[PDB]
RNA sequence: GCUAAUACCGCAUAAUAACUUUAAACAUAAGUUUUAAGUUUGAAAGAUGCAAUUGCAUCACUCAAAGAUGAUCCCGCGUUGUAUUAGCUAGUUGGUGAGGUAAAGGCUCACCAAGGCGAUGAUACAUAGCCGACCUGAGAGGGUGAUCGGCCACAUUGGGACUGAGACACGGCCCAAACUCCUACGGGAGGCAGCAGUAGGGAAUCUUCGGCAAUGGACGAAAGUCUGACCGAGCAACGCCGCGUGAGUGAAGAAGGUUUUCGGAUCGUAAAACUCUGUUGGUAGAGAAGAACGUUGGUGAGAGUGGAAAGCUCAUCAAGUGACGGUAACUACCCAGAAAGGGACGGCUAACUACGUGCCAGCAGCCGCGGUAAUACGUAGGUCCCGAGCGUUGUCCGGAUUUAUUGGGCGUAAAGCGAGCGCAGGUGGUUUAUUAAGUCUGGUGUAAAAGGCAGUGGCUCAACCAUUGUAUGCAUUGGAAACUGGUAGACUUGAGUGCAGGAGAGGAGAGUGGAAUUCCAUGUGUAGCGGUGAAAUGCGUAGAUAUAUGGAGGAACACCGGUGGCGAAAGCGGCUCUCUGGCCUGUAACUGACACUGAGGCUCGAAAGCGUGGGGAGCAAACAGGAUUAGAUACCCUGGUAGUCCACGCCGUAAACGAUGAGUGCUAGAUGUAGGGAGCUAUAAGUUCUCUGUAUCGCAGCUAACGCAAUAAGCACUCCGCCUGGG
RNA sequence: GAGGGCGCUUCCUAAGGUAAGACCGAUGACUGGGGUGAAGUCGUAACAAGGUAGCCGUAUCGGAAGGUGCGGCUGGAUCA
RNA sequence: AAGGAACUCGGCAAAAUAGCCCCGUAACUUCGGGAGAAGGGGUGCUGGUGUAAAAGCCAGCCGCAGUGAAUAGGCCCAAGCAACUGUUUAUCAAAAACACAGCUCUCUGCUAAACCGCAAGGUGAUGUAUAGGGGGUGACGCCUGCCCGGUGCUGGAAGGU
């Protein structure tokens, strides 16, 4: 249903780039901004755009492939499940994929990264890897 | 598997049998369903050595022990070895002891024990079956 | 009868103790807090002494002035299983009063009020000392509570209660009971779950040993005293360590064993010899381990104690600090001489040939074996792993992800309820701001300890002990608005409600029509018809079937009818009415998240059958007759009861199916067909998009395979449910 | 005179009896099922369209495998 | 006394319990009952205070005894039969006998059938097949199997008589 647009996102992430195709769709909000605009900085899609006047705007977005299409992304998942909202601590986040996969975390401060996440003393929900 | 379900989840279990039932053997005070403090063996008694019959087609003729239990359970456990010495109203240990080939039993019989002669020099140990080091 | 008191006791003297007061800063439902008037009562006038500005030390009541210790109870937190552990609770639960207490407190008790708990587990039953800790698992954890430390509880059993500051008290009392002893029978006495030790019972004896110096406590001014606490000695290979019984040279297969195809092969560095050596032990034993501090006296310092006295504080010396004791250690080290065995060999994991056997006796955790040469067994040799321990079972952990949070599955292999609701409960479209609840940061609590990560010393070095840190929701308090929750706020962009469309076997009643079956008469004619592989079954000459008609009644309604539709399914098809849901197409007209679910509870619901009352054509359980064959209680035939149908109540179980839960998101296409929306193709034709439908193939994905795949067995999340090897 | 032990009844009251259970174990003439072993005997079923394919839920008749019937599904055939 | 049913075929008779209040109450059940189950307690008077509408309180006084006597259930377990209430031989027998609702079958379309009377007349009943008459059995629960040879009954007519 609609109570997990967050991994019905990158689940539909998974249909575009398992399903080798250029652009997936997103309804508006702020926490998926920063999904494309933190991965987008990571180099795993190439655009940011969403529907100009909707509550439901269409975030329509083209991918960062390989070489032939191919992929970059591979074991995206939502960490955190709408039942289960994730609160590690801040000391000790642990590396993902022994430093090959991503991290982001909605600390105190904001929703950042791996290893400002980490030595910071930042801590939060973890939100996903890859 | 929903929120209510997976914590009304235990992580449960349900084949829990250790392979001997036992009252071994033992205080004897007033009333001896004492339960459970398990020995390898029982200071007890049983009566007669008898034959059993084994599987198909095993065609042999092994010798179980008419074992007495005070809780109401099998009057049989496997004498090992060759032949016997013991009658009825002798003490027998009792060996944990399974054998697929011999139906109807439990417990085997530790021969090998204080009421129980045998040859040495065997090629398994030299000593069970009631025996030793051979002095000379 | 009387002493004595380092006993008692009246009784002024003690009042911040409690209250009696008068004002209030304070004070919080209770309230807490300074002073503003009146009350109880003390001693071992003791003690050793000292001596003296004739007064100075150890103490009990004077009793406070606190700390300190050790307790008290209340609350938060986690602290077993059985809902085949449902309704439970009578002082129960509130209120008032009183007694008590160290205290609020049905803490009790009186009186007056009736609540309260509980299906999100209360009571009742089993079971349990609990925790730090500790064995195993990489961890997650599982598992244990041994021994150590803490708390709790107990003292043959049960119950009271005094004392004591403190007990309802292992070695107090009193009562009872149960044993036992003595009794001249009239009475008395006791409880090793204290350390021993005895008898029970087993796997489970520490010894019926010393002293308290090495502390620990108790009094005593000190001395002293006692302590089965502790320290030690002796029992247990019961565990952990450490060394070893020989080492070095010298190996030829050597004498030697065994196999033996007659060769070769053991002894593998004592090896057959040779050279030595003292691990542990031989003996002589030198020493013999420091196990050790002052309390007792002196000196000197301080309070310098009206006083130096005396004494007290504590800065010196003298002074015993024993039990392992000639104790470990060390010299003389004696001779290689006193001092290694246990398990295992079919694999399963490394170690097979002589080998009586002959499925024989036996061996075994699994596969197993043994019936003629068995590396299975008995059997010797060689070997394979270990050691003062080997192996065996008894328990537990792991593997086992074998309840899979980490770390499952549900189409068939175990599994989606038989389907609907709309109770809790769960989950949440977007956004504005607060909130910091949770969430992250800092301070605060944390096991006395003991224990890990390190280090130190040491019984050597060992092992482990002693030490020293490190390492911790044990906690409470500042910050963070990024998420969730909450709080207020907004929009529709999900849902639904509007306005237009249609559609159907959707339900429920009320009726109607025809064909067809069977039967009532019936024309008028003769054995017929039945059934199969055939007939007997049978009926029928009482002459009929069959054919001519009309009537009667029940049932059901061929093409319509279809991978068609509707309905959650179950299911629903002559025809016509009655009132009746449910979608989809468009639509923002509108609410502004009203959403999804769904345990519980509720409803519906195949098929029969069961209740009452009808209707009773055809069909057909039950049964009969005839084949059938050995037989036929079956398939066939002849029949033929229940039953099938109608109103009227019930079971709640079906291959429920598609052995495929519900919600919604995603997306190669070839493809069906509905009915709309839109275009569309125009001088009538015929095409394209859109939605729910239901196929068929097949992209990706996909599984054990089979297969699924837009109405996913693909990729996600919320509600539920199942599933743990078989009988 | 107060007060005092005794003087002096009551309260709670430990144990014992009572009654009417409930729970739980042991126990039991005969007896229902199930499993095991013989290799007796009865039988053709279930397995191929396994000899009437079945498989269910249900009623009902058999010594028994089983049958008859209500309705449903292939986990069914020659291929209908 | 003491002892109890040992007497007897048999606790037969007597005994003993019972009132009122208040507790409490098993079994199965057709769910009402059982059941007054059982078993238990109290019960007199004096003053209070609360009893008058109203018990309980407090204390005391007493008592052998407190519904002081009279009057007023013995209970329990189990089985068979019958359901029950009713009725039943007065001059014997009260029951398992009868009856009874119930259930079953059969007969009767009306001037009923059936019945009474020679008939007439009348009942049946101002009744109309849910009614009337006869037969069985006797609630409720389960169930009612087989055999039409014979008998009777019904129906049919071919033939014999």
Same mark, same amino acid.
């Given at each position: 249903?609609?109570?997990? #647009?967050?991994?019905?996102?990158?689940?539909?992430?998974?249909?575009?780039?398992?399903? =080798?195709?250029?652009?997936?769709?997103? #309804?508006? !909000?702020?926490? =998926?901004?920063?999904?494309?605009? &933190?991965?987008?900085?990571?180099?795993?899609?190439?655009?940011?755009?969403?529907?100009?006047?909707?509550?439901?705007?269409? &975030?329509?977005?083209?991918?960062?492939? @390989?070489?032939?299409?191919?992929?970059?992304?591979?074991?995206?998942?939502?960490?955190? =499940?709408?039942?289960?909202?994730?609160? *590690?601590? !801040?000391?000790?986040?642990? =590396?993902?994929?022994?430093?090959? @996969?991503?991290?982001?975390? !909605?600390? !105190?401060? @904001? *929703? *950042?990264?791996?290893?400002?996440?980490?030595?910071?003393?930042?801590? @939060?929900?973890? &939100?996903?890897?890859? | 598997?929903?929120?209510?379900?997976?914590?009304? /989840?235990?992580?449960?279990?349900?084949?829990?049998?250790?392979?001997?039932?036992?009252?071994?053997? $033992?205080?004897?005070?007033?009333?001896?369903?004492?339960?459970?403090?398990?020995?390898?063996?029982?200071? $007890?008694?049983?009566?007669?050595? +008898?034959?059993?019959?084994?599987? /198909?087609?095993?065609?042999?003729?092994? /010798?179980?022990?008419?074992?007495?239990?005070?809780?109401?359970?099998?009057?049989?456990?496997?004498?090992?070895?060759?032949?016997?010495?013991?009658?009825?109203?002798?003490?027998?240990?009792?060996? +944990?002891?399974?054998?697929?080939?011999?139906? +109807?039993?439990?417990?085997?019989?530790?021969? +090998?024990?204080?009421?129980?002669?045998?040859?040495?020099?065997?090629?398994?140990?030299?000593?069970?079956?009631?025996? /030793?080091?051979?002095?000379?």
């Amino acid at each position: 249903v609609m109570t997990d #647009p967050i991994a019905d996102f990158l689940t539909r992430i998974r249909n575009g780039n398992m399903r =080798k195709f250029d652009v997936v769709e997103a #309804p508006a !909000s702020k926490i =998926k901004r920063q999904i494309a605009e &933190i991965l987008k900085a990571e180099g795993y899609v190439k655009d940011v755009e969403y529907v100009e006047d909707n509550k439901q705007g269409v &975030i329509r977005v083209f991918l960062k492939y @390989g070489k032939n299409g191919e992929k970059v992304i591979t074991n995206l998942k939502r960490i955190s =499940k709408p039942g289960l909202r994730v609160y *590690v601590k !801040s000391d000790d986040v642990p =590396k993902v994929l022994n430093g090959l @996969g991503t991290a982001i975390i !909605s600390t !105190s401060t @904001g *929703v *950042v990264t791996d290893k400002v996440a980490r030595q910071t003393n930042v801590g @939060g929900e973890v &939100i996903a890897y890859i | 598997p929903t929120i209510n379900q997976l914590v009304r /989840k235990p992580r449960r279990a349900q084949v829990t049998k250790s392979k001997s039932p036992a009252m071994n053997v $033992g205080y004897n005070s007033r009333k001896k369903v004492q339960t459970k403090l398990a020995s390898p063996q029982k200071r $007890g008694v049983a009566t007669r050595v +008898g034959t059993m019959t084994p599987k /198909k087609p095993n065609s042999a003729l092994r /010798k179980f022990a008419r074992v007495r239990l005070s809780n109401l359970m099998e009057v049989t456990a496997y004498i090992p070895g060759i032949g016997h010495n013991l009658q009825e109203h002798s003490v027998v240990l009792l060996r +944990g002891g399974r054998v697929k080939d011999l139906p +109807g039993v439990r417990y085997h019989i530790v021969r +090998g024990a204080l009421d129980t002669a045998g040859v040495a020099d065997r090629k398994q140990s030299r000593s069970k079956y009631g025996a /030793k080091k051979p002095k000379a």
